């Protein structure tokens with residue numbers, strides 16, 4: 001079992017057994033505490049269904065997907081070695097009903113993929129079947145024996161103390177101070193509880209040197225009994241803010257913090273990193289702080305109702321005044337009747353007062369309206385952010401998450417994993433929920449692994465917490481997945497080495513081309529594993545490389561264009577699997593944007609609208625390094641303009657429509673490509689403006705030979721969005737004109753915009769969370785408050801329609817002005 005821990009450490013990228021960077025047993029208690037829910041999920045899941053992981057959705061089949069089916073008949077081609085027979089199938093027919101219709105144990109598995117069609121669910125309720133219908137692809141399956149479930153085998157009093165809390169600041173120690181000579185420094189100790197300061201105490205500004213002592217006893221205005229569970233002693237250093245460290249006043253065992261503490265401090269408003277209980281690991285270079293500390297038990301009038309209702313109606317970013325807070329609390333039993341009032345009501349609570357917390361806990365016990373109400377993701381996500389530090393408030397949100405089908409868990413997984421950063425303690429209801437859903441489904445578990453792993457590799461603030469959560473997962477997923485992750489980690493480690501070695505060696509010379517091909521030759525010849533699962537697509541199995549097709553892309557960060565043969569021999573097409581390995585940009589920023597685009601698609605699915613978005617695979621694997629999916633038969637918009645006019649930016653309107661006519665053979669395929677372009681442009685115009693990533697150079701915008709348009713490279717981040725005259729010519733418009741396709745485009749854009757406006761609260765919370773956990777540069781109140789204006793908060797459907805149509809005209813009025821200005825900066 002000693003070699004097993006060594007295996008886990010290699011799969012995590014962090015040692016959970018290491019106690020070099022702790023001042024308490026929280027992580028070890030969490031490791032022990034997670035054993036119970038781990039073994040509780042392993043010994044409760046269906047062993048057969050877990051091995052086959054049926055990717056199913058209980059959501060209704062949309063209006064656009066029903067029109068594709070003929071006489072309630074879906075053709076599915078079943079394969080037997082060489083022979084194949086197409087069968088007429090009803091959408092309501094279960095996989096078992098189709099099997100009895102074939103012969104008149106064996107399971108139906110997709111050709112080329114490790115995706116199975118099992119379970120008591122209709123054929124139309126499968127995610128692969130819905131994908132085939134959307135792309136107009138034919139359903140091909142191979143009849144083979146189900147996988148052995150034996151392969152997934154798993155290895156066997158505080159309220160008695162009226163004293164006003166005090167902290168002794170002994171002093172600060174830094175080995176080497178920066179060259180800036182000379183400034184003054186003071187210690188700012190704050191008692192926080194969900195980004196809310198309960199009390200603040202500063203020190204006398206002494207000069208900044210390698211050693212600064214104080215011995216100062218800082219007494220706070222808050223009593224020891226009034227300190228809540230999850231409150232943080234935030235120790236800061238100002239000149240302005242340079243060093244920070246946090247300490248949980250109440251431990252994981254409900255005890256008040258007592259003793260001597262030497263904490264190593266992080267260097268430099270809404271950032272998730274400023275909340276961490278973890279100290280800086282680099283003890284030989286980081287600023288230190290010495291402190292001294294010397295068990296917690298478990299009818300309204302008309303005008304006022306209108307006031308309370310107007311408060312509940314406001315957006316999540318709308319600030320609450322003292323009057324608003326006092327009203328929500330006085331009428332807390334009326335506020336409990338409205339589930340949308342819960343975030344605002346729980347922000348109105350005076351957490352620094354015991355009696356109020358007790359009354360809040362009494363209020364939370366009266367949960368009946370909350371338990372019965374329909375799950376609102378945006379509302380549930382609101383209670384899991386930086387503004388909520390109470391485990392009872394946070395648990396009622398985790399309670400509502402339990403009703404999410406494995407389909408929707410995948411939609412919000414990244415953001416739920418990022419929400420763990422807002423948890424005061426390592427062991428939390430949300431951490432246990434992710435673990436439970438990760439062991440219940442192989443797909444969620446695979447994605448959870450990479451989501452946690454991406455954070456362990458490039459975040460010292462949260463690497464310890466996530467390493468415990470991952471170790472807990474890896475100790476219950478099974479040896480089948482354990483070996484798969486081993487093969488995936490091995491290939492990634494080997495390929496990342498080559499990416500940086502090649503980058504060290506503007507133009508792509510013949511020397512570097514042969515060097516990469518030689519490096520890949522040495523790796524394929526007895527070193528690289530024969531087969532590995534694609535991190536961005538668990539179904540797809542990659543095998544041997546295609547060294548001939550392998551190259552180094554003509555980009556400033558020298559990315560590796562890699563092509564692999566499909567390891568699955570039952571594969572239909574002989575098309576290679578394409579992966580891009582890149583270093584230099586934060587791919588976590590691309591992971592977040594792309595997952596939001598997948599959320600935006602599912603939002604449009606509820607309104608039965610299909611905006612042809614292309615949220616390609618992108619997984620962050622390490623520090624500034626990760627992988628991308630190669631979208632087959634696609635080119636850059638700038639590259640299409642470079643065919644006619646290369647070196648210069650004399651952009652011609654006709655080029656795009658000529659490129660589509662060239663790549664599409666039949667005239668019907670051209671109209672189908674223009675039809676795909678009409679929807680894809682519409683979706684990407686709305687999605688980009690809402691997120692405020694509209695202003696882009698056409699080098700970062702792509703199109704497929706099938707007509708599908710898509711934005712790329714979000715690692716970087718005037719016009720509201722990108723609507724150029726060349727895009728408008730495909731529609732059939734030039735200058736001040738109209739077209740049957742432009743009239744269509746304007747109608748779909750407005751349909752898409754107002755469809756997202758129904759899920760305003762969801763988008764606002766997902767965006768607010770994105771800027772805190774994934775954007776270390778965009779951490780201001782004004783940065784988050786952009787989404788409100790973009791989505792037109794508190795506006796009529798007519799005004800909002802008119803607002804977006806004006807943004808369309810701004811792009812028409814500018815035309816090429818923005819792209820031409822982009823050409824004078826990025827290119828030259």
Ligand SMILES: CC(C)n1ncnc1-c1cc2c(s1)-c1ccc(C(N)=O)cc1OCC2
Nearest residue numbers: 559582616628629630631632633634712713
């Ligand atoms: C600058 C590149 C490496 N980058 N940084 C973030 N995302 C990307 C890319 C995404 C995609 C790219 S590059 C792409 C480029 C060319 C082809 C192609 N077919 O030539 C296919 C591609 O995959 C789709 C997304």
